[PDB]
Write a protein that binds this ligand. Structure first.
Ligand SMILES: Cc1cc2nc3c(=O)[nH]c(=O)nc-3n(C[C@H](O)[C@H](O)[C@H](O)COP(=O)(O)OP(=O)(O)OC[C@H]3O[C@@H](n4cnc5c(N)ncnc54)[C@H](O)[C@@H]3O)c2cc1C
Ligand SMILES: Cc1cc2nc3c(=O)[nH]c(=O)nc-3n(C[C@H](O)[C@H](O)[C@H](O)COP(=O)(O)OP(=O)(O)OC[C@H]3O[C@@H](n4cnc5c(N)ncnc54)[C@H](O)[C@@H]3O)c2cc1C
Ligand SMILES: Cc1cc2nc3c(=O)[nH]c(=O)nc-3n(C[C@H](O)[C@H](O)[C@H](O)COP(=O)(O)OP(=O)(O)OC[C@H]3O[C@@H](n4cnc5c(N)ncnc54)[C@H](O)[C@@H]3O)c2cc1C
Lengths: 469, 471, 469, 470
């Protein structure tokens, strides 16, 4: 047999069912079709493309040792490149993994019909998901918009398997079509600025496996009390690796459940909730693929926004005057990642405080986030605008005085990303516009020149939001 | 559908095909039927029974945290106990894993025939092996008889898979049948002495996975450089955990295979070589079940006039033979229930070629003392030492303890730990004090014949008493 | 014998000559006279006073466990308080250590003259200093105007022992006089802002002993290669404890000297150089007291200034547009300490770029430095203004491009204290105004809104100095 | 000036009063005069001489790094070698540190008189003790009888200090006196066996400052609860280093003293008690040189012994059937060191259970111990003998069933030095003879085959000694 594997966002060799199907039957021809025209509005952002350039290099380096290597093709049409690979490789079967974004859903089915009619067999295995969105029903069949009612039933009867990495790898003697090597992801006018994200990130499937041993045996023990704290990479940093499919979610769920069974047996209650807080976070990634599968284009709510370009640039540069918002936008753009509670605040500020279009705030998240996912990002904005009964309503404006006192105690997250407020005490570190002048100047801050004043008064933004509902 | 899971030597949940097959179809019913009379001359030993008692107690607490308890059963007939569990729970399928011991080889295929007549569904799975002995074929007849030619063909193709542990399980209902209250595995007079085995061993599958993680990440880096030595944690110390099936062979194999792949793209020239020896070490266990399958007795039927000396037999157990590697090996074997591989090639070659003692005498001692008392490994180990297999050693091959210790134990640090009386004896004579001059022996406070015993047998006599005893 | 141990800036118990001589004689009455009126402009600043309140509280409970409590007195005249402590205790002798500042020099000699005439014996010992300035002279009595010829001579002689803390203690047990528990150091208008210095500093003498045992066996090995690094606290962080006398320099020298002898015969060509740069640095504290002794006020090289108050606020708040200067002024305000290389840059920028009075720059250093030392700070400004033969010429300015490449490699000091310059490459991390406009957006740095433009051009400031000399 | 330094038992530089004073006055000419014929009975043993050789070359290496060598001299008369060094060097003052052995007490003072009559300046400093034995005066004239009352007197003054190492060194011109390159400390027959002491000891003043800092900062907080134990590094292993004067007694005292002050205000509870035991442990060394100073050569009893040469070989090589005694003898000979609580067990077993002459035990402890202190080893045997008031009477001995139940619980100390008793339960581990026959067959213990039977009954030693105490 001659099989052609099609890597998309399953950039790994471990537990790859499409790759395990190959190399178990005949020869393998790895290929990566990169068609930017067919991506549409879902084109990968600036930082998301940088992770793709490094992961594909780490992938091609991995496949180069197994026996074959990793063909990259930039084409104007995916089917035009797939049918052209079969021309030079003489393959009789093509295999790939599942992707549930709106562009790949209609493309996986179109690629099927075009070459299955031609006597060439296809097969699409389960990838990046523990449960397919067509494997669960409420007995009846109603969709569980309730994540609580969703994940409560997913914990019942797991029936899958964990695969292996292929020991060997065979490749036919072929030619080339239309081939490329490495271009179309990083712009020369910003490569030096993009080469600085390596300070806190290292793309690759093997580096992802090092992270699992760094988090399971050492950091998952007290994850329930660290995830609440926002200052420190307190969580697992597995979002960029899981999006690009560098870690199989089977492994992320198996070894985490393995720790839960040991802690549930050792009477340990601190680790039990730590495993619950992490496994029920893994289910949210599965919940995002379930909603986006039967609720694509939910969020059909177009109320009078306030398309102010200048007020949007201050939200990107962290000049909104709010400490917890400006620090989050400072962390997002410095490391390409931010905590979940930070995203909740900086996104709510973009729609509830500034009335900017939610698409504008998402297009910036889609561009600068290293973990820029499609199902998870949309799911986060639905949690903000009030599209799920298990999320905060659009009308509420959380007071930063108590909001910072929950996720960022002692104000150590602002004093790390906003060094100008390093002497402002924790009593006013989340809201300098409430402290008297006798303690503001004592802290060294001068609201106006030393630190930006609040861009929008919260007292006037509460009623003005309810003034249009 | 109610399904009875029959635990035997697969005391684990991570990759248990029989346990994963059940608990997914419907209900589950764990049971450990302990029938000592059906196991003949190779009834589980003394220390190995102690390990089994602690693992079963840990297995009981592990399963009770998932959903169902564990039915500990000690009856007079195993098949009678299986038929008793079917009627009390209403089960319809009996599921267990594969075992290749001659006792279970003839009764596992008997339980199937007994239950097919009654209509009870049965299905066996490969639990503690990656290549079953009937899966490797050729185009001719017989196996390979050489491990090099056997393991060369196993590395050609590979189709494995790792199963997941179920987070939920369901008990059946009503009354229980004959139930054993965890009894028989220990004798009242030798219980405090068996508790001393906890100093270097913590049985159970939970500590088994942590050791596999510790060895792969922090010790497989230089396994090829330490496995050839004896001192300290030279190897992985996974034999007692792999014998009772607490870690699946695939989980141990793939962890060193995954680490070997990363040690290739990073051009770790000596890294992937360390995984080659460890994986081939696992292959020796695979090759043990191939010989034991085709040759199902206990290529080893050479019993000639032995020196049935019970006085020289107790001097070999307690480690008082004048040979440091032999004495220190028998000192660690009885104090920790374990010993290095190269030392087992020494203490047993000394038992059959230096003392002319029966090989069944030393093998019965390994059965009671070794926690990793593997039937398939304890047979292949003694066959490799004698001239039974052309895999390595012959019958008329003796090794000088001088070049033997300096090859597997430099600086003599292994003897000084288990023989304090030879602490100030230099490494040049630490492995053979009799060949050292009296000017250094008294300076090293040895004094043969009072503190450390003189060599019980001469190296030249054992060669002249054996070459003239073969015809 | 009833003795009075006048604690001043010797806030320790171990290696205390005046405390040991008074203990091994008879009774001990420790007292601390705090007269802010006798202090001229050398009155302790905001940060330096906070360190005094913590060390004195630690000193109070320290002696409280040995046998005698600590007495703090805030009076109008020090001699009036000393005469009061004598008439309430009957102490026939008053002992103290040495202080070489101009105010405390004429005071100790006035205290001796006023107490000797009353029949009360006085005794002074060497404290907080290896060898006094009146003990180092060649065959000629010429004071060493150069430091290279200074410390090279201090190593050719060594005669000073080290003593242990007193074992026992007892009190003359008599009524007290005017007993000012704790007044003057901290005002309530800035108490919470001052309490935030506990993040990176823990004042006390036992914490100083905790600091040495960590710096010797762990950080002194490669001190020569870490002193060239500005990022982080690469040095020892011993200046605050040495200024307040919380640990004697004899123990600081003896621990580093024996480590050098250990590395001497060990063929350690890297440990000797590390012990050298630390001991040569200890000599700078020794050299500061030498110039402060027979050179009262040289630093009288004044030149016309441009005292711009608005340009002085930007120098404090770090709004000067220079990344290496603003990052240092942020660290000076956040933690009250900065590296020696940073102090050279931020002080030269105040006098050589903005043309601000050197006293104004010192008035801010003296107020915000936890290690605010009179002899060390003046010696620092003498090194910048060009008042030393082996210093820096006042007529020349260093290019921040090559300046950052010398003391801040990899560019990690700006990315920590100025998070807006995170993705700005090292090629322009020290000077964003030289970078092209194409990379100023790739680095997400808009000068008019993100990080302010340089307030004064470098080439103009270099010629403006030559325009008035 | 030019001063000659005489290193004898002060092989250190951190705090050496005779070395730092000689460095300031002028030139430094370090000499190490040995002369075994003047030692006689107090000649260092086999293992103790090995430490002296390794610590000598290491101290000679550290001296040359400063600027002055170390002249090693082996002579027949120590005074003839001192005068030979003065003429070839031209020195004026001869300096050295104090010692408190009967040899040096009459030798150093003889050096003083013969060099004073010739016009050579001499000055001896204190560098081996906190308070010198003549600085303490008690009652009216009885030099105190016990230690618990002696050390209370030392805790009522304390005018100590410490000194710094001198970075400068300069040796004069020509010399070449009657110095040898290597003496006769090691014999070729016992050299490879002596090299096996490096695995447990790294002698020298440089390493001495390492485990000193390691002990005070790490394993001192819980010294009050680990001093009674024996397993592992229970104590500080500072006995051999303080014997050769590689660490100043003031630095050892003032380090644990500084931790007690910090643990006082913080109220560490166990911290103050651990210092109160370690400092009073140093006080026993202070009392060792005190009782040995006023008394010559309280330990002179020649009652009928049992001079059995075969019973001496069993107690020496650890074959007496007593695991707590046999394991100690196998440690004392393997590592050249043993815990203090083991010494009162292996030495009391030799003089009471076996009735062997105590000189046979003291001669063996002098050869195999690296910390062979003349002033301290004698006091240890006096504690075993019925001599010291606060000590063991001659007719007292404890059952090992209670010794291990308090000083060595869990029996992990025996299973390391006696592997043949590993599976023996921790109850009968210190006395296998009293164990039932079922546990002995189960624990592989065959008293008389693999492990030796008790060489002497405990009830016999009590009844045999009663007839001799009349
Ligand atoms: C507005 C908004 C936008 C978001 N955009 C993304 C995105 O683009 N990509 C992304 O991976 N996550 C996104 N999330 C989820 C969340 O920000 C990250 O999953 C998490 O904060 C970082 O992962 P971690 O490994 O550090 O933490 P952990 O909590 O340890 O991550 C657990 C894993 O489970 C999944 N997961 C965790 N939380 C969620 C969630 N809320 N929704 C979906 N899956 C989840 C991810 O695979 C994640 O790696 C978004 C959340 C919000 C509120
Ligand atoms: C006379 C004799 C008797 C032996 N009896 C046993 C026995 O009863 N039980 C037992 O498990 N091993 C036995 N062996 C093999 C060998 O002693 C052990 O495998 C090894 O010493 C312990 O392996 P480890 O887990 O400590 O380390 P590693 O060697 O790192 O473990 C590798 C694993 O592979 C297998 N393995 C490794 N070497 C061999 C080998 N030579 N033969 C077979 N399998 C091997 C084992 O499952 C082992 O756990 C015997 C060898 C000899 C010479
Ligand atoms: C403008 C300016 C102002 C300064 N103001 C002070 C001050 O107020 N207080 C202060 O203690 N030091 C001052 N210094 C000296 C120097 O900044 C600090 O000694 C040092 O940076 C503190 O870090 P450290 O103690 O970890 O350094 P290390 O080098 O690790 O410590 C060496 C020690 O030696 C002394 N020392 C080292 N370098 C110098 C130096 N250049 N001048 C004087 N003493 C030195 C200090 O006691 C210091 O603690 C100043 C230097 C300059 C250029």
């Amino acid at each position: 047999k001659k099989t052609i594997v099609w890597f998309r966002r399953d950039l790994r060799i471990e537990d790859n069912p499409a790759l395990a199907a190959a190399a178990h039957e005949g020869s393998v021809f790895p290929v990566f079709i990169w068609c930017p025209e067919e991506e549409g509005q879902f084109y990968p952002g600036r930082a998301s493309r940088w992770w793709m350039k490094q992961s594909l290099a780490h992938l091609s380096q991995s496949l180069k040792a197994l026996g074959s290597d990793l063909t990259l093709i930039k084409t104007h049409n995916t089917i035009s490149a797939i049918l052209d690979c079969i021309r030079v490789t003489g393959a009789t079967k093509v295999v790939f993994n599942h992707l549930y974004d709106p562009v790949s859903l209609v493309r996986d089915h179109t690629v099927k019909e075009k070459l299955v009619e031609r006597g060439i067999s296809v097969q699409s295995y389960n990838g990046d998901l523990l449960y397919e969105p067509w494997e669960i029903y409420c007995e009846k069949g109603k969709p569980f918009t309730s994540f609580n009612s969703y994940w409560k039933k997913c914990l019942d009867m797991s029936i899958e398997s964990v695969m292996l990495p292929p020991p060997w790898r065979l490749m036919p003697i072929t030619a080339a079509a239309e081939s490329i090597e490495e271009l179309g992801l990083e712009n020369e006018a910003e490569k030096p600025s993009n080469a600085l994200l390596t300070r806190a990130w290292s793309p690759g499937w093997s580096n992802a496996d090092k992270l699992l041993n760094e988090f399971i045996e050492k950091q998952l023990i007290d994850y329930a009390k660290n995830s609440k704290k926002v200052v420190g990479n307190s969580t697992s940093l597995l979002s960029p690796y899981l999006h690009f499919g560098e870690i199989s979610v089977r492994h992320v769920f198996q070894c985490a459940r393995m720790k839960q069974i040991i802690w549930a047996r050792d009477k340990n209650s601190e680790g039990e909730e730590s495993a619950d807080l992490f496994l029920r976070g893994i289910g949210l990634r599965e919940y995002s693929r379930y909603i986006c599968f039967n609720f694509p284009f939910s969020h059909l709510r177009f109320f009078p926004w306030d398309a102010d370009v200048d007020k949007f640039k201050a939200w990107r540069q962290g000049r909104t005057g709010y400490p917890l918002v400006d620090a989050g936008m400072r962390e997002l753009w410095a490391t390409g990642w931010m905590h979940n509670r930070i995203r909740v605040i900086v996104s709510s500020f973009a729609v509830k405080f500034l009335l900017l279009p939610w698409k504008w705030g998402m297009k910036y998240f889609w561009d600068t986030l290293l973990d820029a996912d499609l199902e998870c990002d949309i799911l986060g904005w639905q949690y903000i605008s009030g599209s799920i009964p298990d999320g905060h309503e659009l009308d509420r404006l959380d007071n930063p005085a108590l909001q910072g006192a929950k996720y960022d105690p002692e104000g150590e997250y602002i004093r790390q990303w906003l060094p100008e407020l390093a002497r402002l005490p924790t009593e006013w570190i989340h809201h300098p516009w409430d402290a008297p002048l006798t303690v503001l100047k004592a802290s060294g801050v001068e609201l106006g020149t030393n630190y930006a004043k609040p861009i929008v008064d919260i007292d006037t933004a509460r009623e003005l939001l309810a003034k249009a509902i």
